[PDB]
Short mmCIF file of C-alpha atoms in Angstrom, two decimals:
data_model
loop_
_atom_site.label_atom_id
_atom_site.label_comp_id
_atom_site.label_asym_id
_atom_site.label_seq_id
_atom_site.Cartn_x
_atom_site.Cartn_y
_atom_site.Cartn_z
CA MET A 30 133.00 101.96 183.85
CA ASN A 31 136.53 98.98 184.71
CA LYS A 32 137.46 99.39 188.21
CA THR A 33 140.49 101.96 188.70
CA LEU A 34 143.34 102.56 189.46
CA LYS A 35 145.35 102.06 193.26
CA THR A 36 146.96 105.27 193.83
CA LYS A 37 145.32 108.72 192.69
CA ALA A 38 148.50 110.50 191.70
CA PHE A 39 148.70 107.86 189.03
CA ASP A 40 144.34 107.31 188.77
CA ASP A 41 144.36 110.86 187.97
CA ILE A 42 146.12 109.96 184.56
CA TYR A 43 144.09 106.62 183.75
CA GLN A 44 140.83 109.33 183.53
CA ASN A 45 142.39 111.87 182.60
CA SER A 46 144.06 110.74 179.55
CA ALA A 47 141.62 108.90 176.72
CA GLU A 48 144.06 108.49 174.53
CA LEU A 49 145.81 106.45 176.82
CA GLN A 50 142.95 103.92 177.85
CA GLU A 51 142.30 103.84 173.81
CA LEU A 52 145.24 101.95 173.25
CA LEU A 53 144.85 99.85 176.54
CA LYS A 54 142.11 97.88 174.89
CA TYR A 55 144.46 96.39 172.80
CA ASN A 56 144.89 93.18 173.44
CA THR A 57 148.25 93.43 172.15
CA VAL A 58 149.12 96.44 174.35
CA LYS A 59 147.19 94.31 177.38
CA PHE A 60 149.68 90.80 176.33
CA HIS A 61 153.41 93.48 176.24
CA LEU A 62 151.76 95.03 179.62
CA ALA A 63 151.19 91.43 181.50
CA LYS A 64 154.52 90.20 180.57
CA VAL A 65 156.30 93.24 182.46
CA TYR A 66 153.13 92.54 186.13
CA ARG A 67 154.82 89.06 186.29
CA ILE A 68 158.51 90.57 186.97
CA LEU A 69 156.93 93.85 189.61
CA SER A 70 155.38 90.39 191.69
CA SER A 71 158.08 87.70 191.61
CA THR A 72 161.46 87.74 189.20
CA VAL A 73 160.81 83.71 189.55
CA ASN A 74 158.29 81.26 190.10
CA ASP A 75 159.54 80.35 192.77
CA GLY A 76 159.27 83.48 195.54
CA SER A 77 161.32 86.48 195.73
CA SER A 78 160.60 90.07 197.20
CA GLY A 79 160.09 89.68 200.34
CA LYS A 80 161.10 92.83 202.86
CA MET A 81 163.35 94.88 199.56
CA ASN A 82 164.16 92.73 195.76
CA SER A 83 161.23 94.80 194.23
CA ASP A 84 163.95 98.18 193.38
CA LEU A 85 165.85 95.25 191.81
CA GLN A 86 162.65 94.14 189.70
CA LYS A 87 162.26 97.77 188.54
CA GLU A 88 165.14 96.97 186.93
CA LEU A 89 164.45 93.80 185.04
CA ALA A 90 160.96 95.24 184.16
CA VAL A 91 162.08 98.39 182.26
CA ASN A 92 164.72 96.01 180.82
CA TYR A 93 160.90 94.73 178.48
CA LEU A 94 160.45 98.25 178.08
CA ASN A 95 163.46 98.90 176.22
CA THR A 96 162.30 96.59 173.63
CA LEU A 97 159.16 97.81 173.69
CA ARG A 98 159.52 101.17 173.08
CA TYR A 99 160.15 103.73 170.34
CA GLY A 100 163.47 101.66 168.49
CA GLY A 101 162.57 98.67 170.19
CA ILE A 102 163.10 95.07 168.80
CA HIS A 103 159.73 94.57 168.93
CA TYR A 104 158.43 97.43 169.53
CA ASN A 105 154.31 98.25 169.21
CA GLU A 106 153.01 102.07 168.41
CA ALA A 107 150.11 101.38 170.74
CA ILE A 108 153.11 100.61 173.93
CA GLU A 109 155.40 104.15 171.74
CA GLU A 110 152.22 105.73 172.49
CA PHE A 111 151.15 104.53 175.92
CA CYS A 112 154.03 105.15 177.19
CA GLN A 113 154.49 108.95 176.13
CA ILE A 114 151.21 109.68 177.03
CA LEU A 115 151.72 107.28 180.45
CA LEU A 116 154.68 109.72 181.14
CA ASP A 117 153.63 113.09 179.20
CA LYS A 118 151.20 113.71 181.97
CA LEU A 119 152.92 111.76 184.78
CA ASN A 120 155.48 114.67 184.04
CA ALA A 121 152.92 116.73 184.06
CA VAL A 122 151.55 116.86 187.27
CA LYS A 123 155.50 117.51 188.73
CA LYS A 124 154.16 121.68 190.32
CA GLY B 15 170.87 99.29 183.32
CA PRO B 16 169.68 100.19 187.18
CA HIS B 17 167.50 102.98 187.26
CA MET B 18 167.21 103.26 183.59
CA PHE B 19 167.09 107.12 182.05
CA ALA B 20 164.16 109.97 184.07
CA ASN B 21 162.01 108.00 186.86
CA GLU B 22 159.59 108.05 184.33
CA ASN B 23 159.65 104.53 184.05
CA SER B 24 159.73 103.27 188.01
CA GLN B 25 156.28 105.01 187.49
CA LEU B 26 154.94 103.38 184.62
CA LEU B 27 156.02 99.82 186.20
CA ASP B 28 153.98 100.54 188.72
CA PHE B 29 151.48 101.58 186.76
CA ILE B 30 150.77 98.33 184.65
CA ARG B 31 150.95 96.68 187.69
CA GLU B 32 148.32 98.91 189.51
CA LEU B 33 146.44 97.56 186.27
CA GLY B 34 146.99 94.27 187.27
CA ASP B 35 145.84 94.48 190.59
CA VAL B 36 142.62 95.64 190.25
CA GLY B 37 142.03 93.90 186.80
CA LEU B 38 142.48 96.10 184.29
CA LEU B 39 145.58 94.72 182.42
CA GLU B 40 142.43 90.80 181.77
CA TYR B 41 142.98 89.86 178.57
CA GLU B 42 142.15 86.99 176.15
CA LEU B 43 144.03 85.75 173.32
CA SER B 44 142.56 84.73 170.39
CA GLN B 45 144.85 81.60 167.90
CA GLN B 46 145.24 84.24 165.33
CA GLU B 47 146.54 86.46 168.87
CA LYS B 48 148.48 84.18 170.36
CA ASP B 49 150.71 83.67 166.47
CA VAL B 50 151.30 87.16 166.21
CA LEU B 51 152.25 87.39 170.22
CA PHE B 52 153.74 84.21 170.53
CA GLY B 53 155.52 82.81 167.79
CA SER B 54 152.88 79.84 167.95
#
């Protein structure tokens, strides 16, 4: 009943993973994912990201998820499963 | 470290990114929820 993704390759998983969507309902999940969304948009609140820099933002973004995944510091079960289920289908689409 | 193991994380990032771009990442936190996440 909500929005759809922008990339069809990604939208595929989002529609084909109920276990992923159930996790995304949790505000604890939703919150931590918003933390990283800030990063892919900008490294600073001045601006950043003109015609590059985004590949660098990739790192800073992973830096966050590294603390959210299995064996992190403030890792969450729904985030652990979130990344697992997500990447699961992302690797299961690779031919 | 610049581009960690596999490209899963890479896809994960833009995935979550698309969520917030269309309005799937929008949320609301109660006082209790803010205490456990922000700590205050």
